[PDB]
């Protein structure tokens, strides 16, 4: 590998929880920065924006499951950054889920008012990256 | 090189893909007939001044996309005129300029990959691919 997919890697193996973490504008985010804390038992990391928490990255173990959310004051999108994803969502108005499979580069938009869970489909950590509008 | 799984053969198509090194495209699925999917496989650049552009085919259908950099390419100055954003860097090294609204000197800045950057509204900015290979950022509006 040459440089640049060499720092490719790191960063891959730093989201992926199997690595160590890879100017002073306010703009700027570093990925050096990121700090992953575990909520309801699932690793979550966000890059500093003006406002908090609005791009961001999900870090799940082998097959776990994110129990049913809603999605409220921002529309969500999620993408898959490494790894295989099951969603289940039910918008307003319907009453069937839709149930999408996701692969790395896959990405999903979760309206507002939908109800949507999420499960790392392999038995492998997955990470998926959150991003609000 | 460590032998890949297949995580990590899908992984790297996708990037090979977006750095346009690869003919193969990311991999499709049957959730691609889902409304509210968009998937890799339907990815398709188009050249502008060029610098090619992909965007998924979302709802509002210019709010999530990629743009790949030749080596050294410059993308001209633009104002975040409408919709602020951010730029991620998926590959690749990128110098990007910024004079924000109110402000009087432009400043400066270099990103690696997973670095980002918040564009304001109305902030003036121009990015240059900062390495002799091709660079790949994703651009997220808001």
Same mark, same amino acid.
């Given at each position: +590998? ?18 160590? %973490?890879?100017? @002073?504008? %306010?703009? #700027?985010?570093?990925?050096?920065? /990121? ?6 038992? !699932?690793?979550?990391? =966000? ?23 809603? %999605?409220? #004051?921002?529309?969500?999108? /999620?993408? &898959?950054?490494?790894? @295989? =994803?099951? #969603?289940?969502?039910?918008? &307003?108005?319907? @009453?069937? @889920?839709?149930?999408?499979? /996701?692969? #790395? ?12 869970? !999420?499960?790392? %489909? !392999?038995?492998? &950590? ?5 991003? +609000?509008?």
């Amino acid at each position: +590998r040459d440089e640049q997919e060499e720092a490719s890697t790191k960063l891959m193996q730093w989201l992926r929880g199997v690595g160590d %973490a890879p100017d @002073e504008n %306010a703009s #700027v985010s570093s990925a050096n920065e /990121l700090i992953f804390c575990q909520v309801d038992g !699932i690793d979550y990391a =966000f890059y500093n924006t003006k406002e908090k928490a609005m791009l961001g990255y999900m870090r799940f173990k082998p097959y776990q499951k994110r129990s049913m959310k809603q %999605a409220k #004051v921002h529309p969500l999108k /999620l993408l &898959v950054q490494f790894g @295989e =994803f099951n #969603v289940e969502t039910l918008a &307003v108005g319907e @009453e069937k @889920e839709v149930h999408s499979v /996701l692969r #790395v580069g896959d990405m999903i938009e979760i309206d507002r008012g939908t109800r949507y869970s !999420i499960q790392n %489909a !392999i038995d492998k &950590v997955s990470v998926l990256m959150c991003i +609000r509008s």
